Amino acid sequence: GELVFGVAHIFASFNDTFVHITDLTGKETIVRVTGGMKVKTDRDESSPYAAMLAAQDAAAKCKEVGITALHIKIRATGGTATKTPGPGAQAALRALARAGMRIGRIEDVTPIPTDSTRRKGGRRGRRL
C-alpha cells in the first residue's frame, strides 16, 4: 500500500524517442526528457542504446523525486504516418522496469484515424 503511481507517455518514432513522466493526470509533468541529449550525433536518436540512456536518466530523476510505480502508455506518430512503435519504445520500457520501478497497465494510446485526410507523397510515394 506504499506505492504511488505515475504515468509515462513513451513517445516512439523512427527518428526520435521521448520519455514523458507525469502523475496520474497528464498535467503537471514531473520529467520531460528526449533522446536527443544523451547522444550528440543527430543520427541514433531512436536507437535502443539512446532510449536506454534517456529512460534510465528519467528513472533516476523520478526515483529522487519520489515516484516509483509507473503506468505505461506507448504512443507512436499516429494519424497519417507509420503507426508502428519505434525501436526505442521497447528499450525505454525495459529501462523503466530495470531501474527498480514497478510497471503497470501497459497500454497503447496511438491516435487512430477514421480514414482521415491525405498523406504526403503525391500519389507516387517517397520515391528514392
Partner 1 sequence: KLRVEDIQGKSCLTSFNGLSITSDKLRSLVRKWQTTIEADQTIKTTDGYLCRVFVIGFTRRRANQVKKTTYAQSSQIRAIRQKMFQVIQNQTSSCSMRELVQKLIPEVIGREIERATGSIFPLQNVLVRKVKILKAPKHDAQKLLELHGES
Partner 2 sequence: TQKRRNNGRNKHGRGHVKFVRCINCSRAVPKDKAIKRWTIRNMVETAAIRDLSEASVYSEYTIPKLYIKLQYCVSCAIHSRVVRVRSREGRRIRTPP
Partner RNA sequence: GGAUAGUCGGGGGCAUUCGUAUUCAAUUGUCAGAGGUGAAAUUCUUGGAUUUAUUGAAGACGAACUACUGCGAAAGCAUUUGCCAAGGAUGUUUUCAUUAAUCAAGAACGAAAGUUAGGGGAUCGAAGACGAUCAGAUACCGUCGUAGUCUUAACCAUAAACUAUGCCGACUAGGGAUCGGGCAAUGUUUCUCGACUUGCUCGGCACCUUACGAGAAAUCAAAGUCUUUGGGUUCC
Binding footprint of RNA on the chain (CB under 7 A): 9, 11, 13-16, 18, 20, 22, 25-29, 32, 34-37, 41-43, 45, 75, 78-80, 109, 111-122, 126-128
1 vs 40 by CB, closer to RNA = 40
Partner touching 1 among RNA, partner 1, partner 2, none, CB below 5 to 8 Å by kind: none
Closest distance to partner 1 from the beta carbon of 106 (Å):
9
- Can you tell me the distance from the alpha carbon of 104 to that of 88, in angstroms, rounded to the nearest whole number? 19
Closest distance to RNA from the beta carbon of 95 (Å):
17
15 close to 46: Cβ distance less than 8 angstroms: yes
- Can you tell me the distance from the alpha carbon of 59 to that of 62, in angstroms, rounded to the nearest whole number? 5
